[PDB]
Amino acid sequence: LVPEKEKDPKYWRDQAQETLKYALELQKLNTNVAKNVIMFLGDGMGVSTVTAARILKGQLHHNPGEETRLEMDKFPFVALSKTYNTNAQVPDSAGTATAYLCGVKANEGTVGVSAATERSRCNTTQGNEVTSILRWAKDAGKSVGIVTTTRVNHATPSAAYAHSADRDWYSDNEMPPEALSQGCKDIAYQLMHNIRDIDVIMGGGRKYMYPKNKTDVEYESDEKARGTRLDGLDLVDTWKSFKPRYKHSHFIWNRTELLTLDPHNVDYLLGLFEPGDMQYELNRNNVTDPSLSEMVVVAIQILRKNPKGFFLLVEGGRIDHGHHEGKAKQALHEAVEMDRAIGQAGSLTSSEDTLTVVTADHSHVFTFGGYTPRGNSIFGLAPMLSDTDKKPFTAILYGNGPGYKVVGGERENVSMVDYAHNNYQAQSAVPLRHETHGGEDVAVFSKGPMAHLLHGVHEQNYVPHVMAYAACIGANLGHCAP
Amino acid sequence: LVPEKEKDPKYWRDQAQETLKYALELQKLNTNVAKNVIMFLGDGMGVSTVTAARILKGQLHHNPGEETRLEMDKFPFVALSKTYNTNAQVPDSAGTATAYLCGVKANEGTVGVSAATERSRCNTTQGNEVTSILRWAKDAGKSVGIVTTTRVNHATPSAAYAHSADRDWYSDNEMPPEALSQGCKDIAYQLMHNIRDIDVIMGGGRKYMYPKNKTDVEYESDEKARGTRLDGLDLVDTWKSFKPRYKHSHFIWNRTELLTLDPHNVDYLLGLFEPGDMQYELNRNNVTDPSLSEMVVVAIQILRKNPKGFFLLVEGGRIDHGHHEGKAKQALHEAVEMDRAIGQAGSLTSSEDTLTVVTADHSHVFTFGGYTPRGNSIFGLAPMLSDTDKKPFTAILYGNGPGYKVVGGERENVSMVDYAHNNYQAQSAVPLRHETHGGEDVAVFSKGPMAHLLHGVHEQNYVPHVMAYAACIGANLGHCAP
Ligand SMILES: *[C@@H]1O[C@H](CO)[C@@H](O[C@@H]2O[C@H](CO)[C@@H](O[C@@H]3O[C@H](CO)[C@@H](O)[C@H](O)[C@@H]3O)[C@H](O)[C@H]2NC(C)=O)[C@H](O)[C@H]1NC(C)=O
Ligand SMILES: *[C@@H]1O[C@H](CO)[C@@H](O[C@@H]2O[C@H](CO)[C@@H](O[C@@H]3O[C@H](CO)[C@@H](O)[C@H](O)[C@@H]3O)[C@H](O)[C@H]2NC(C)=O)[C@H](O)[C@H]1NC(C)=O
Numbered sequence: 001l002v003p004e005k006e007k008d009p010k011y012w013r014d015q016a017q018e019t020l021k022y023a024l025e026l027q028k029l030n031t032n033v034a035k036n037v038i039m040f041l042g043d044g045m046g047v048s049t050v051t052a053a054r055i056l057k058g059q060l061h062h063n064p065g066e067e068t069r070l071e072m073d074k075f076p077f078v079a080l081s082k083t084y085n086t087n088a089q090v091p092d093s094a095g096t097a098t099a100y101l102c103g104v105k106a107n108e109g110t111v112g113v114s115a116a117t118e119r120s121r122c123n124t125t126q127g128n129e130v131t132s133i134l135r136w137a138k139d140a141g142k143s144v145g146i147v148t149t150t151r152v153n154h155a156t157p158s159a160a161y162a163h164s165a166d167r168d169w170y171s172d173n174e175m176p177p178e179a180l181s182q183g184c185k186d187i188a189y190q191l192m193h194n195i196r197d198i199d200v201i202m203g204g205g206r207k208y209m210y211p212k213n214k215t216d217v218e219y220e221s222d223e224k225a226r227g228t229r230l231d232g233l234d235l236v237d238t239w240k241s242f243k244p245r246y247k248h249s250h251f252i253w254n255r256t257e258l259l260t261l262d263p264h265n266v267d268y269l270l271g272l273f274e275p276g277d278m279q280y281e282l283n284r285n286n287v288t289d290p291s292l293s294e295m296v297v298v299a300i301q302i303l304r305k306n307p308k309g310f311f312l313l314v315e316g317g318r319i320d321h322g323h324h325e326g327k328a329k330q331a332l333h334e335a336v337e338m339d340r341a342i343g344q345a346g347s348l349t350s351s352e353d354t355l356t357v358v359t360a361d362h363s364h365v366f367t368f369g370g371y372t373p374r375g376n377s378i379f380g381l382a383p384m385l386s387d388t389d390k391k392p393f394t395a396i397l398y399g400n401g402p403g404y405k406v407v408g409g410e411r412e413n414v415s416m417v418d419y420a421h422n423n424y425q426a427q428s429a430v431p432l433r434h435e436t437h438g439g440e441d442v443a444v445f446s447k448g449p450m451a452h453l454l455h456g457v458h459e460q461n462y463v464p465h466v467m468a469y470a471a472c473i474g475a476n477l478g479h480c481a482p
Numbered sequence: 483l484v485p486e487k488e489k490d491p492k493y494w495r496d497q498a499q500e501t502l503k504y505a506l507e508l509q510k511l512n513t514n515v516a517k518n519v520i521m522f523l524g525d526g527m528g529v530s531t532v533t534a535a536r537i538l539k540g541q542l543h544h545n546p547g548e549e550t551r552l553e554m555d556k557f558p559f560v561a562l563s564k565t566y567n568t569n570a571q572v573p574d575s576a577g578t579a580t581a582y583l584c585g586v587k588a589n590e591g592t593v594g595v596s597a598a599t600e601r602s603r604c605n606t607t608q609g610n611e612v613t614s615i616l617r618w619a620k621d622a623g624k625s626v627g628i629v630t631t632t633r634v635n636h637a638t639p640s641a642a643y644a645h646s647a648d649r650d651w652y653s654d655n656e657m658p659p660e661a662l663s664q665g666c667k668d669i670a671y672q673l674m675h676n677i678r679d680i681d682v683i684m685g686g687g688r689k690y691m692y693p694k695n696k697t698d699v700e701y702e703s704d705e706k707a708r709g710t711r712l713d714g715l716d717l718v719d720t721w722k723s724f725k726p727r728y729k730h731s732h733f734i735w736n737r738t739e740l741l742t743l744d745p746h747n748v749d750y751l752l753g754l755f756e757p758g759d760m761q762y763e764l765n766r767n768n769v770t771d772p773s774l775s776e777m778v779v780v781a782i783q784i785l786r787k788n789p790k791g792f793f794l795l796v797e798g799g800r801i802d803h804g805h806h807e808g809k810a811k812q813a814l815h816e817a818v819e820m821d822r823a824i825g826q827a828g829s830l831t832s833s834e835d836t837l838t839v840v841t842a843d844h845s846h847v848f849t850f851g852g853y854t855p856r857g858n859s860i861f862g863l864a865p866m867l868s869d870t871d872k873k874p875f876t877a878i879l880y881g882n883g884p885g886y887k888v889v890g891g892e893r894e895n896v897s898m899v900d901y902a903h904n905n906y907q908a909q910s911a912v913p914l915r916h917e918t919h920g921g922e923d924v925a926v927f928s929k930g931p932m933a934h935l936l937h938g939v940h941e942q943n944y945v946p947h948v949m950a951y952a953a954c955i956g957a958n959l960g961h962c963a964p
């Protein structure tokens with residue numbers, strides 16, 4: 001390939017010098033207070049995923065891809081974070097969630113409780129609850145918002161509002177008899193009850209709000225889509241029942257309604273768009289369900305109204321479930337979508353008053369290599385066959401996962417399959433039903449007020465302490481001297 | 483496990499707040515000029531590797547390891563860098579070397595020349611040479627030094643002094659006939675000939691300095707270790723012949739001589755401790771060959787004398803051949819050794835005048851996962867057996883390494899192997915003679931004067947432009963503007 005400009009050294013020299021110029025300008029720091037704080041979480045968005053998603057964004061624009069700049073690559077400050085859990089070398093989504101949201105690391109499986117709480121032991125929850133940055137923001141008067149493509153009671157969003165001993169306790173249906181008897185409340189219940197005045201809530205997880213065997217509006221025929229609540233409660237009503245009557249509060253379940261809403265009119269918005277998790281972006285129906293980008297836009301429009309500010313938590317989410325199934329095309333595409341929503345949030349907010357942080361809870365066993373040439377598709381094959389089995393191999397390869405396919409002592413001859421298909425599973429070293437997480441460190445991109453405080457290699461619990469300090473919320477309100 | 487201190491939230495909160503205080507203290511930036519510039523290059527040290535080497539270091543101290551802090555983890559500033567070559571999506575060791583040393587991105591295989599030079603096309607070299615930061619320093623009066631565990635003529639260090647159309651041209655013995663007739667000179671020749679006043683040069687690669695069929699001093703019996711220069715030159719003598727007589731210039735080949743040298747006496751040092759690349763740190767002979775840290779200590783002592791300053795290029799090196807051979811235990815120990823050398827250099831220099839940068843040329847398809855518990859050995863197994871083949875699997879798994887083991891249609895039952903052996907090769911998805919590189923981005927840790935300028939995600943060619951600007955060398959000397 002080699003573009004003709006990339007053959008000339010002056011091109012690279014000017015490129016670096018201009019980057020040097022801006023780097024020198026960034027010595028003048030943004031010490032302003034963070035009126036708003038927005039946190040993007042790519043579930044499973046390791047540095048390997050970020051690079052591959054960069055190539056994909058550019059390749060979808062008929063470019064080689066390596067030289068493309070993701071919206072998160074345009075953030076000025078980058079830092080790594082150590083994801084290890086108190087119990088787990090390779091962490092889960094729940095324990096990490098307690099770290100970057102509540103400011104404390106916890107055991108695998110727990111949500112919003114310290115390491116003293118034992119998983120599935122409900123009687124150890126009491127006294128060990130840890131509040132999240134969401135609460136600190138609402139307690140400081142700011143509006144709060146949660147947007148995700150996974151269930152609203154999934155592990156990543158649940159750490160914002162709930163304090164449960166097990167992340168699997170989505171509704172009272174999944175709770176064991178002892179847990180209910182000890183007084184534990186399910187995650188869905190805690191969504192409406194813990195913090196009642198949560199301004200914006202959008203995402204999947206509809207079935208966990210309606211009583212059991214109740215028929216779902218979008219899929220009335222689906223037995224899976226039926227409600228799960230043994231309590232016989234309409235939590236959707238319970239949502240508005242805690243809201244003041246004089247305040248306009250709407251519940252929506254499909255995209256047509258979402259686009260029709262006027263943000264100046266809506267003071268509280270609850271949107272459950274699917275019984276379970278929302279579909280992948282490659283499988284989304286254009287008319288019925290909304291994309292993450294549009295969902296983030298309407299949220300900011302609603303939340304911008306509060307003069308005290310707002311906190312918004314967005315989760316790409318589905319990247320995790322994508323890597324879990326070994327379908328790199330699904331996961332990588334989800335990552336590009338979140339990047340678009342990050343760029344849109346840049347047009348809806350100002351860098352002077354809004355602190356934006358893009359990070360991930362953990363990495364994955366996703367590997368992308370094979371000495372591919374410049375421009376070679378991110379889902380493409382290696383240039384040469386393996387010296388051993390004389391068979392070609394994909395550039396994308398997983399360590400462990402369901403992509404391991406060995407036919408009778410021979411690895412799959414990939415030249416005859418559709419490896420570019422959306423649901424193709426790259427080869428694996430160890431067969432597993434689902435691919436595992438990764439203990440590697442993840443990146444933290446930060447732009448805005450006090451983003452230079454997210455420097456270097458530090459722990460994962462450190463991230464929310466920076467945001468809270470910049471916004472003058474939480475425990476350390478020293479950024480604004482009284 | 484669950485450390486008892488980590489069960490209390492106040493522990494994490496205090497620790498995070500402490501990180502905040504120093505983060506704010508780093509708002510006072512280091513605008514001093516860089517008298518000295520030290521660059522550590524972990525050959526193949528991806529984000530997956532730094533985390534694993536972190537776990538290893540702490541575990542060698544009978545600790546869990548995840549909480550351990552590598553010397554590079556204590557650097558204040560981290561940044562990601564784009565490694566792609568002009569010809570290759572997944573880069574090689576040579577083209578990357580041209581970027582972070584000479585400031586321009588190049589084709590795979592070319593060293594010290596721009597993207598217009600074609601691999602093995604010797605007649606395209608003239609006019610396309612790009613100078614390195616090593617040259618800018620020696621042209622600026624500072625002493626210069628190269629320390630590596632690979633051959634002194636290998637790909638990574640060669641970009642410092644040489645401008646060759648092919649990295650395989652170690653000596654004239656490996657050069658094709660047309661290259662010689664077109665006037666191309668080998669790398670080893672260019673080491674002594676391109677830059678005559680290179681103060682310190684240490685590493686392997688003896689055979690490329692001595693005439694053909696000669697005898698290696700350490701191994702008189704090995705025919706492979708016998709010299710290879712068909713031109714019949716003693717490049718060691720060529721070294722001293724260019725050095726001034728009034729300046730003391732010593733050549734050493736074993737550890738006993740190196741530790742006996744007095745740095746106050748030595749003005750020029752050439753130390754070749756092996757015919758080829760030096761041994762792994764796990765197989766190094768204590769008396770004959772020195773560790774990288776020992777080489778760095780004495781090297782810094784010699785170069786510190788120059789009052790105008792010094793530049794030192796260090797390469798852990800053997801990390802790459804460790805990943806290539808699929809033996810993670812070899813590579814990881816190599817990485818920890820490089821980290822120790824970073825700590826040694828930290829006491830020998832001051833952060834006020836010395837800019838230290840640690841980066842990598844590329845990544846590897848090396849990943850570790852499996853939801854292992856806290857402390858589980860980095861070379862240990864997963865907690866549970868795979869649901870598919872009902873056999874255990876190692877935590878470390880390679881994408882496409884030689885570790886692929888199928889015994890009669892089934893992957894190897896690892897309960898029967900010594901996965902802790904130093905030469906064990908973790909399992910892979912695709913069998914190859916050597917494991918491939920990785921298109922993932924690498925980290926750049928920076929401490930010292932103007933280290934805050936290596937921020938965010940930028941290209942790989944940008945690293946030397948920061949160092950040159952801080953040291954007031956190269957084209958842009960505006961940092962010391964009158
Ligand atoms: C993996 O499967 C592929 C099938 O896609 C095998 O490669 C295929 O090889 C056949 C012959 O071996 C090729 O068909 C024809 O071969 C003759 C050679 O005499 C030639 O006249 C034709 O031009 C044509 O190539 C076929 O094209 C080729 N397919 C591809 C996609 O390359 C491959 O051998 C299998 N690998 C192993 C290790 O079994
Ligand atoms: C992978 O290798 C391991 C280790 O050789 C195999 O596990 C071994 O399986 C045998 C079955 O013949 C076990 O023997 C049985 O053990 C229990 C008590 O341990 C007892 O109920 C029986 O009387 C019988 O002796 C053996 O202990 C076990 N070894 C270890 C170390 O766990 C495993 O089967 C191999 N997997 C495959 C798929 O071949």
Ligand SMILES: *[C@@H]1O[C@H](CO)[C@@H](O[C@@H]2O[C@H](CO)[C@@H](O)[C@H](O)[C@H]2NC(C)=O)[C@H](O)[C@H]1NC(C)=O
Binds near residue numbers: 286
């Ligand atoms: C709406 O979604 C449908 C299907 O999900 C898309 O329709 C495709 O349109 C392209 C050309 O635009 C055709 O090649 C495909 O065959 C169509 N597929 C189907 C199943 O109808 C449509 O592009 C989407 N519209 C958007 C995203 O605005």
Ligand SMILES: *[C@@H]1O[C@H](CO)[C@@H](O[C@@H]2O[C@H](CO)[C@@H](O)[C@H](O)[C@H]2NC(C)=O)[C@H](O)[C@H]1NC(C)=O
Binds near residue numbers: 253256
């Ligand atoms: C999405 O949801 C709205 C929910 O109201 C649906 O619109 C309703 O349609 C029924 C009859 O089907 C009418 O009686 C209601 O008045 C409508 N509601 C509103 C607010 O207009 C709508 O059908 C759905 N849109 C899609 C794409 O399914």
Ligand SMILES: *[C@@H]1O[C@H](CO)[C@@H](O[C@@H]2O[C@H](CO)[C@@H](O)[C@H](O)[C@H]2NC(C)=O)[C@H](O)[C@H]1NC(C)=O
Binds near residue numbers: 768
């Ligand atoms: C020199 O290297 C040797 C390894 O060759 C180290 O001594 C080894 O100690 C272990 C510990 O049980 C023994 O298994 C080996 O047999 C020993 N080998 C030899 C050759 O003594 C020794 O500690 C090293 N010394 C230093 C100063 O690093």
Ligand SMILES: *[C@@H]1O[C@H](CO)[C@@H](O[C@@H]2O[C@H](CO)[C@@H](O)[C@H](O)[C@H]2NC(C)=O)[C@H](O)[C@H]1NC(C)=O
Binds near residue numbers: 736
């Ligand atoms: C390393 O190098 C030194 C010098 O090359 C070696 O010391 C020599 O030892 C021999 C005996 O084998 C003597 O005849 C020479 O006079 C010594 N040279 C000097 C300059 O003193 C030494 O043998 C080597 N050490 C090792 C472990 O190989």
Ligand SMILES: *[C@@H]1O[C@H](CO)[C@@H](O)[C@H](O)[C@H]1NC(C)=O
Binds near residue numbers: 121123124
């Ligand atoms: C709660 O649970 C366990 C029994 O599962 C028991 O150790 C203990 O007595 C109870 N209380 C606390 C505070 O853990």
Ligand SMILES: *[C@@H]1O[C@H](CO)[C@@H](O)[C@H](O)[C@H]1NC(C)=O
Binds near residue numbers: 605606
């Ligand atoms: C360089 O190399 C080849 C030698 O085979 C020849 O075609 C050509 O004349 C030369 N090209 C240039 C630009 O010197």
Ligand SMILES: [Ca+2]
Binds near residue numbers: 218253254273274288
């Ligand atoms: Ca829907």
Ligand SMILES: [Ca+2]
Binds near residue numbers: 700736755756770771
């Ligand atoms: Ca030796």
Ligand SMILES: [Mg+2]
Binds near residue numbers: 043155
């Ligand atoms: Mg999630």
Ligand SMILES: [Mg+2]
Binds near residue numbers: 575632636638799
């Ligand atoms: Mg090398």
Ligand SMILES: [Zn+2]
Binds near residue numbers: 043044320361
């Ligand atoms: Zn996760």
Ligand SMILES: [Zn+2]
Binds near residue numbers: 525575802844
């Ligand atoms: Zn390399």
